[PDB]
Design a binder for this molecule. Structure first.
Ligand SMILES: *N[C@@H](c1ccccc1)C(F)(F)C(=O)O
Ligand SMILES: *N[C@@H](c1ccccc1)C(F)(F)C(=O)O
Ligand SMILES: *N[C@@H](c1ccccc1)C(F)(F)C(=O)O
Lengths: 634, 639, 635
């Protein structure tokens, strides 16, 4: 199951201390994301040194012998017919030419990831780069030194990679970060870490720039996030079922066996397990047993069609992860040196098309994830579709001065709207580039950036959705306690007023049946559903059988006693979640993040509450409640 | 290799005679495509009959006894609160309300309709639907009798409305029109009459069972994926033919390049290309071409060739993965509720949701746009003298280029094809509306997406037809070129002797004859301002300085005058003769031979009366009807 | 007002008999659309003849004397450096080269005839150098219904498709021509049948024939005609929507729009205020919000209330693009441009279809906006929570469990809007560097025009469904009014017969007035439905406010049960305000002229059959008759 694979990724991200780069051990998207985001994570380049030096030696010696090899004794790109013996000058003129970006930047996280991925490519021993340059890359990475790199210019990653090469050769115009607090010209940065500027040998300029390292770097953290957010969305579908009073049957194994898309079986299998012994599903069964024939037979699509919907999304995100990791673990470079067979091989491994195309697909899948969240949120906000919950999840009781999560609802539409726009492909906009030499190009970095922007929005949407669901948990729990009060007040008052058994039964059924949030604002308002039902019953008990006096007295005593006792339990409140598999999420948001039920009495704005949830998602603290919730699933 | 899988698909499409529909043998995209396109292909429903009858009687009993089951004793969609014991009228009312398409005729074609009927029939064999076996038999008979309802093109968010027309046929709705063969349209009651059927009266759940499926989206996706596989393999293969005509370096496909960047589609496409180009007579000429003035010529090829395996990689993987997804849907019970009669429950879910097909249709349309762009880039290089390594601009034979613009028209159309294709590849799946009284707040739009991908494939067929036609032109131009260069050499060689020129002059002159691209001076071989006589003049001056007399100058002047007399006549003669060989040793011989001999074409020029349309039309027709798979299979023989 | 301009376009489309082509008289999009669609419309080429022959003469002379002029003594496109004195063969080689489309699908005859018209018109300016006699042949071909069959694709904007018209004129055997609707013959037989002989191309003539924007602009012209008509139609139907939904017409108040004065906002609101002023339905709406006022919405939802703000950019986009397309229709889209007066061949790019291209992209986005408005309005009309008394799906019932009303149309509306939104992505953002990199910018105007055309097909579908639904809503509103009165009468008369106190009678009559009738039509005396539910509350209340009374109330309840349903069934059967409404022409056209009725289980015709009739009438222009009646007297 993909659920195991994603939990494996989260663990790896959390547990990795050293990333060994040795030409053989795979680097995963978790390793890359951990390097980028956790400063205590170090690179360990393992002396594959033998194959690096052989390749390096082969390239320099052949170049000096005057062998005819692209970009070592020839011009670059469309200029490949020009030959030269100016070995170092050739390489230097390439870097000069490629220092061509403009600051209107790629972040340090991306840049460091690119540095790791370039270093990794070199370990396969096809590049002809010197071992010493690799050691400098490892040292730069572990010292938190990174060039400032312009955002744009790559069609996929010559220009952005030229800034890493610029740093390594000490270009004065290249600015490097040393940690978060220091910016200095490249020569000063090299000095401060005990390095001297390199003099480029044969092929070294080209080897440093001819990779897919920036596209693949952004794609790696994109894929790590996409896996985690994917699992988070699937899991939260179960919380949605619980708070909305869904029917868990939608996740029944036979439904999905019979339409066996792997993502459909696996998401449904997770959802069946999450909901198996749910206290909230127990309430759901109670709810639909009261006036069963006046209530929906099935849930609406946002819940009931969730496994079918998630299926291609799971599969796209899983497959794209494989593709990105293949790219991470590849010699993306040209020429490829086949030193064992005494030849340089001319091809196009710099071409980031596998990554670019899959970036387009994943952005579409992320939009699909956003649409599901938006549809669920919309249902949650509308009393007609929420099975007893108040509109906008407004606690009130005075709804005229409590518009609940309406702000969050509007924002969800804005989030989804922009997300859907972002999901158009980048890959269809291929221009014939670089003197028409690059007449196909992947645009993978640009695509990766757009998928990253899409995920930023998805994070906003998940934070909002989780926050609303926590609100909804409190509201369901308050609902149960409120209904018990109403029943108790109705029962005891019927006794006191000495009403017949016929009467008491009719009134207690009303007290159990009418949704409490329809009348919470003013419980004894004669135009609201509680008293409406009560009056209906009282007339019926009169037709079926002083009795009038005892009924009028009941209605007066209820008018005096009920709202006060409802306010009491409400104020006290300001439990079923204790038995829910989603307890860790509720406990995380309420206790660890220090929040409470949302209302006019709570001073914290929706911003303040959703910001905490969002920050926990952005920095990965959300995986703790996620891993606790999933504990024991196999 | 995906290459084996696609060859398998093609074999299955050509060879199948009966599609067995039995609830356990899988139906592939090739079977669907063969049913749709080959009218000798028949459906065989295999009496799964037991579980089907158990299911339908289970549903009927439960309903009669008043069991609470969605869409059987319950209103539909957003109205599922409403209960009824009006079992047949409930189902009748669903069909009436769903007969809501409009003919703009634009319609779903018979091919997609018949495919959809097969897929619905297939879903039913899993015994989860509650449909009567006799309705299933009716579907088999309609299929085998070539009777199809006429179905409006639009209305589905994925396939209630379109499927309602098949249901409408079965119950004899007079407003539903039916095809019988290619030439007859009659009202539904008459169509049933003509094949020995009586209108059905819908039992509990039967109206819903007929309409609550992904049959149309999946029908169009099936023929889309079949075509996408074939066209993909064709594009991959023709990359090798492009290498041969453009004078590429086959090194780009070396197995080590790709082992070291091991995307499965990258390795497998490069593996195919290495095989296609091993021992190529055209690659031999390429090696010779670059050995002459080596240092004045590009060390590497441009991206459209050299980066083809890296470009193809995701395209191969998307198309292969989508085929699996679509076939999983073909072989599914897409219906709701799902009757688990063994455990006496009707399970309420959403197997009618075509999201798997919808999202993959979007991915594939993107992959197809990538295939179009690859063809457009390759075609572009071929038309431009600066990038074609000796070929004339526009692949114009001429020799008078002022009245022969060659394949320029095709070049223009290729830009028009790619442009619209890139536009089409925007996603459909991002346009989800909250539908059906906000009941369907997510919906796949799979049929809409599948239609756009089909449109994308129409354009790709056009591009492949053009590209293949151009490469056959280029084959002829390369073969004529080799012949013309040999004549220039002979004339220069013998005339050098006969004019009594020194051996160092003769050798200089013969170098020029070998090194100058013949198509740069074919228009007028002895024009003093064109590259042949340019080089000859330089060489003649250098000779005078090197051997530095009046006799030398007389003989050199004589050489120029006599070349002026003879060379054009000789060059004209070999060209005319050619219009009246290395491809014989090429793995692409079956393509060249198919286009030239079987389709009856020739080198394009001002002397050929057939227009580019007429030539490309033949190739396009062969791609459209599958005849192109014959040279594809011959070419790939032994791989 | 744009409303007046569109009415002007409609009248011209309907009334034109002869399109005058003379180099000075403007050709409008209505003229193009009428030629395309009404075959009784003829072309009158007015012998501009003198400037044409002068320009023609100039070119032939200059070419024969070996002047250096692009595409007359030089090669084409990227090959312009080649010179030749083979004047006719040069022109012939161009056509040969451009006969390069494929039949997969074809540009329709309507578009091809429009393209022939536009090319002929371009020639009248006397910049092209084409012979007068070729122009007469084009006029004759137009007037005789002869058209080449033309491949759909190949143009980046229109060399390849125009080469088919040139191919017809020179009698290329491989070019197939239509004669009327049924005859298809090779080009030389077609020419022969209308008494023409094949032209032999003179200097520049091949190029003049192919070097225009005629196909993009043809399709764009019918696109813009339809866009104007359908726009006005959607704007107008917003008023009809207000009437059936129980809208508040104040949304169209002139001060609101004076204060945010986008011209399209002012003008659509002005139209809507006029359509809704003293409406009988607005009077029903006013009544509705007066009953339990404080429990009903103070404002309408956006699909109505925000309609003039929404329509504003859409009106403006469609009007400005009409101007732009007409400027193209009336242009010398050719190259070189011959300035015979000053003896210069001017080298430019009037073949570049970019004005049309970008505007087709804009219009497609605006059409998507119109579709979205219709979708949102239709969605509200189907949902009881938002329709202010109307049944879900506009189901008549009474038994809703066997009547799902217009739910099928509702699903289809989502499908239509969805695909329409996708179609509205731009084509102009996909410019490829084409034709040996000579055409490194190109308009793609024909492709874009085709997509806008496709988007308008869907809009037609959406308008047809919406209008059908609103007619259903008219019937349901009038039936509602008749039903409430019936219930009020039955309640009143039965209160008297049971001798109920005035207090009781008053309470019960208010329930009869207040409860939306469609919430209980299914079973009027079901004790779980809103009527008897309201009646029981009032009965308990009257007992508190005041044992023989109980007897009488129990007798009222039994009598109502005997009587109410039958009285309601009778009025409904018989039925199976619009007379004072400005939308009467639309209702009458759909119900009477198209022969339809309220939708229910008892009517055999399917939703398809009803909507097809309405769609066909939109498609062929018959919809403009009720539209013009509805708007009579406006401004
Ligand atoms: N990646 C291409 C290139 C172009 C310009 C400068 C450096 C590199 C290339 F295709 F030419 C290559 O490096 O192989
Ligand atoms: N697919 C949905 C439906 C809606 C309207 C008519 C028939 C069917 C459904 F979700 F409600 C279902 O059938 O499950
Ligand atoms: N439109 C261009 C052209 C190209 C090929 C054939 C005919 C015309 C042109 F720009 F070159 C022109 O005609 O001006």
């Amino acid at each position: 199951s993909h659920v195991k694979d994603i939990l494996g990724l989260i663990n790896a991200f959390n547990e990795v201390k050293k990333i060994t780069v040795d030409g053989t051990t795979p680097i995963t998207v978790a390793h890359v994301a951990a390097l980028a985001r956790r400063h205590d994570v170090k690179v360990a380049l393992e002396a594959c040194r033998a194959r690096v030096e052989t390749c390096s030696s082969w390239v320099q010696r052949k170049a000096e012998d005057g062998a005819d090899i692209y970009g070592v004794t020839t011009g670059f790109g469309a200029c490949s017919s020009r030959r030269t013996n100016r070995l170092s000058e050739l390489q230097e003129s390439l870097i000069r030419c490629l220092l061509a970006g403009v600051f209107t930047e790629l972040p340090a996280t991306a840049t460091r990831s690119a540095m790791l991925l370039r270093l990794n490519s070199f370990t396969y021993g096809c590049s002809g780069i010197r071992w010493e340059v690799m050691e400098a890359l490892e040292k730069l990475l572990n010292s938190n030194v990174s060039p400032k790199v312009p955002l744009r210019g790559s069609v996929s990653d010559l220009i952005p990679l030229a800034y890493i090469a610029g740093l390594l050769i000490g270009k004065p115009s290249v600015i490097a970060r040393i940690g978060d607090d220091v910016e200095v010209p490249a020569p000063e940065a090299l000095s401060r870490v005990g390095l001297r500027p390199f003099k480029l040998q044969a092929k070294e300029g080209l080897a440093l720039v001819n990779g897919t390292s920036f596209a693949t770097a952004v794609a790696s953290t994109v894929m790590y996030d996409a896996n985690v957010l994917l699992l988070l969305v699937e899991t939260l579908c179960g919380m949605f079922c619980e708070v909305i009073f869904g029917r868990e049957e939608f996740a029944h194994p036979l439904i999905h066996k019979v339409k066996p898309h792997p993502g459909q079986i696996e998401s449904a299998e997770l959802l069946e397990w999450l909901l198996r012994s749910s206290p909230f599903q127990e309430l759901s069964r109670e709810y639909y047993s009261i006036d069963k024939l006046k209530k929906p037979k099935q849930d609406r699509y946002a819940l009931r069609s969730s496994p079918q919907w998630l299926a291609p999304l799971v599969q796209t995100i899983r497959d794209a992860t494989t593709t990105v990791e293949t790219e991470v673990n590849s010699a993306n470079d040209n020429p490829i040196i086949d030193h064992a067979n005494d030849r340089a091989l001319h091809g196009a491994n710099f071409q980031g098309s596998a990554v670019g195309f899959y970036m387009d697909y994943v952005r579409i899948a992320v939009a699909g994830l956003g649409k599901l969240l938006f549809a669920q949120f919309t249902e949650l906000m509308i009393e007609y579709y929420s099975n007893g919950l108040p509109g906008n999840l407004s606690l009130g009781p005075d709804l005229s001065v409590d518009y609940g999560l309406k702000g969050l609802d509007i924002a969800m539409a804005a989030y989804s709207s922009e997300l859907q726009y972002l999901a158009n492909p980048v890959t269809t906009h291929v221009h014939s580039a670089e003197q028409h030499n690059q007449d196909i190009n992947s645009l993978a970095l640009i695509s990766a950036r757009k998928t990253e922007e899409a995920l930023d929005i998805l994070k906003l949407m998940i934070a909002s959705h989780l926050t609303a669901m926590c609100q909804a948990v409190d509201l369901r729990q308050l609902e149960e306690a409120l209904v018990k009060v109403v029943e108790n007040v109705v029962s005891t008052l019927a006794d006191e007023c000495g009403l017949p058994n016929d009467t008491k039964a009719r009134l207690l059924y009303v007290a159990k049946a009418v949704p409490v949030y329809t009348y919470l604002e003013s419980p004894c308002d004669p135009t609201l559903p509680l008293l409406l039902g009560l009056k209906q019953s009282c007339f019926d008990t009169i037709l079926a059988l002083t009795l009038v006096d005892r009924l009028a007295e009941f209605e007066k005593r209820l008018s005096d006693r009920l709202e006060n006792e409802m306010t009491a339990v409400r104020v006290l409140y300001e439990v079923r979640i204790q038995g829910s598999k989603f307890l860790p999420f509720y406990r995380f948001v309420r206790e660890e993040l220090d929040t409470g039920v949302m209302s006019a009495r709570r001073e914290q704005t929706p911003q303040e509450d959703v910001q905490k949830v969002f920050d926990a998602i952005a920095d990965g603290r959300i995986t703790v409640p996620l891993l606790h919730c999933l504990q024991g699933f196999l």
